[PDB]
Design a binder for this molecule. Sequence first.
Ligand SMILES: Cc1ccc(NC(=O)c2ccnc(C(F)(F)F)c2)cc1-c1cc(OCCO)nc(N2CCOCC2)c1
Ligand SMILES: Cc1ccc(NC(=O)c2ccnc(C(F)(F)F)c2)cc1-c1cc(OCCO)nc(N2CCOCC2)c1
Lengths: 265, 255
Amino acid sequence: DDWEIPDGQITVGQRIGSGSFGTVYKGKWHGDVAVKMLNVTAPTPQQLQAFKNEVGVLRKTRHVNILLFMGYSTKPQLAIVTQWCEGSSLYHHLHASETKFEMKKLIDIARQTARGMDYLHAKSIIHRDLKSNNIFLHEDNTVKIGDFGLATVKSRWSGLSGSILWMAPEVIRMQPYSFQSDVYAFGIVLYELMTGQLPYSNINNRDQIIEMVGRGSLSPDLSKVRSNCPKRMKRLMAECLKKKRDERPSFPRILAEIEELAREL
Amino acid sequence: DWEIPDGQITVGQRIGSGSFGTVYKGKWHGDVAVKMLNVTAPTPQQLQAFKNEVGVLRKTRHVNILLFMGYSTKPQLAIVTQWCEGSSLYHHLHASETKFEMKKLIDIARQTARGMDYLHAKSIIHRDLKSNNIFLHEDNTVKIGDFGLATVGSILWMAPEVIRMPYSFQSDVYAFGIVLYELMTGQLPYSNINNRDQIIEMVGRGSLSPDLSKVRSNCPKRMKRLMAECLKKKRDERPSFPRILAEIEELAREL
Ligand SMILES: Cc1ccc(NC(=O)c2ccnc(C(F)(F)F)c2)cc1-c1cc(OCCO)nc(N2CCOCC2)c1
Ligand SMILES: Cc1ccc(NC(=O)c2ccnc(C(F)(F)F)c2)cc1-c1cc(OCCO)nc(N2CCOCC2)c1
């Protein structure tokens, strides 16, 4: 129950990515690990509470498709240790490296993602930021879901531009995060896999997306799916992207639908 | 708080049975491996052995240890872990005649050293480290666990003090040396000993030791040295897993 890692055991190695609130390094601790530490030693209360929360939901997860939480360190800096994964994100595969997956591989990635998301909702955990950049393809094969954003955490008076494409219309309106908003973002991930594209490719700017999607005048073009896309996947995709929250399926039914389709090959 | 309520796990195909428990393939947010007691009314030894098993598994979070996922208390005492595809290192090395590259053999030893170095840091003695409990998940990554089912077969990895009858971190290191022997020679130790009663007796008296010369010709010189150190007859002459892992990781980066 004590996943604290004493000072001096982790060798902080090469630096791999940083933003505001923390920097992530590759590390050595009984093998290869990924370490995320706060840049400072005197953390603000909001920074400290985000540390408690992140650990609090990570120590609640034990699943092959969730990034393996391994421990935390509080001295000299607040740090979080996870397993090290080789490869790149689904987003990098689909939209940067032009990686061509066979349809059998695309459905399998969707199935593993559905397993991890079905697990998170069973543990009463809303992901809040499910996008193809936070679906890691461990060794280009197994899915590891996490929150790889080094995003700036809320202050005492804050009330995204790389997550607008996966935001449900009610999240955009902000009048918000639920199991159904996670389901919507999953449908956009389904869209990426089945179409090979990001939604709203014919929309020049992001401000038009925010207002138009939030007002119901914009929806992803479902007609862009590849021809070898399974017919029952086109429907489940549209079911996840329904405008109203209480009409999109829950992940149990989502996973079962996809597990069936996989057995049909 | 890892309890899984009754009725959520779908028990599928049976994978193996013993005198007291059986393990099945299952469906619970994906594929899971479930091991259950055959009976419903468990004895104090069964209830407490169940607690101990869960108690040492819920302290493990490492890529090279079998991922503990949960347990259930109704109607049967069950323990749920991830499902791994493939077969054990023992099956690869001695039944399927799988030819691993020398680079891949050093990799398997390195991952195994990572899993054992992690277990010892958590103050956990394995007591049964053998090539049959080293699962090669998807023919690549190592998963160390206890895949043995008791039926009312681990002599080759027993230190002379364990055979004498005992278990410590150092005896776990010895079994690692025998696992190292398997990888570097492709054979089990004492291939030329007809019966096991002779192995138990001669190894316990120090008159029998693994033939280290049967190592493959391309075995790294420093792997020979580290193998013989892990198999040292005196307990306090065997290295600890921190120094073992560091040696293998250097060797692997040296290629
Ligand atoms: C280090 C770290 C600690 C905690 C967390 N926190 C979560 O994952 C999280 C937060 C909230 N909720 C959830 C939920 F899943 F439970 F919802 C999960 C992430 C990292 C981390 C960051 C990052 O940034 C670099 C991106 O390349 N790269 C990586 N690696 C790069 C590739 O090889 C290895 C992994 C690891
Ligand atoms: C089901 C189960 C529950 C608990 C446990 N508990 C430990 O492993 C354990 C306990 C204490 N300490 C450690 C340490 F490693 F951390 F020390 C590990 C094991 C199983 C289990 C049994 C087994 O029987 C083998 C059938 O061939 N096959 C598998 N599957 C083989 C095929 O694919 C997936 C895995 C899983």
